[PDB]
Amino acid sequence: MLEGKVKWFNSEKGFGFIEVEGQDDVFVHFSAIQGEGFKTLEEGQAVSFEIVEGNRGPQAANVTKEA
């Protein structure tokens, strides 16, 4: 897994970006968010995740919020 920080997220629209030092930022859609409750994220949140790339390019997957 990769580790990152939520750079920003639009709760109403349900997407945003994960910052990772070193690599480019990673687009994250709310469907990638793991766990219970309403799928959303806050700026600066610690997350673990994977990058998945199909014909639309890379985006986050398997996003878990961490302490």
Author numbering: 1 to 67
List sentences quoted exactly from the publication behind this structure.
BsCspB is a relatively small protein of 67 amino acids length that belongs to the cold shock protein family. Notably, BsCspB shows an overall thermodynamic stability of about ΔG° = 10 kJ mol−1 at T = 298 K and possesses fast unfolding, ku, and refolding, kf, rate constants of about ku = 12 s−1 and kf = 1070 s−1, respectively. In previous work, we have used auxotrophic E. coli strains to incorporate fluorinated phenylalanine (Phe) or tryptophan (Trp) amino acid residues into the Cold shock protein B from Bacillus subtilis (BsCspB). Our findings show that fluorine-labelling of proteins utilizing singly modified amino acids like Phe or Trp does not cause a detectable alteration of thermodynamic and structural properties of BsCspB.
The overall thermodynamic stability determined for 4-19F-Trp-BsCspB is highest comparing all variants probed in the present study and deviates in ΔG° by 1.6 kJ/mol from wild type BsCspB. This property of 4-19F-Trp-BsCspB has been one rationale to elucidate the structural features of this fluorine-labelled variant of BsCspB by using X-ray crystallography in more detail. The fluorescence emission intensity is lowest for 4-19F-Trp-BsCspB among all probed fluorine-labelled protein variants. Secondly, it has been consistently shown by three independent experimental methods that 4-19F-Trp-BsCspB exhibits a small increase in ΔG° by about 1 kJ/mol and in TM by about 4 Kelvin whereas 5-19F-Trp-BsCspB shows a moderate decrease in ΔG° by about 1.5 kJ/mol and a conserved value of TM compared to wild type BsCspB. To investigate potential structural changes in 4-19F-Trp-BsCspB and 4-19F-Phe-BsCspB, we have elucidated their atomic structures using X-ray crystallography to 2.05 Å and 2.1 Å resolution, respectively. The samples crystallized in a closely related crystallographic lattice, containing one single molecular copy of modified BsCspB in the asymmetric unit and sharing a same space group symmetry. The global RMSD for all Cα atoms for the 4-19F-Trp-BsCspB and 4-19F-Phe-BsCspB structures calculated in this work is 0.23 Å, indicating that the fold trace of the two variants is virtually identical. Furthermore, wild type and 19F-derivative structures displayed identical conformational rotamers for the modified Trp and Phe residues, indicating that local structural distortions had also not taken place. Interestingly, these slight changes are independent of the number and sites of fluorine atoms which have been inserted into BsCspB: one fluorine atom used for 19F-Trp labelling (sequence position 8) or seven fluorine atoms used for 19F-Phe labelling (sequence positions 9, 15, 17, 27, 30, 38, and 49).
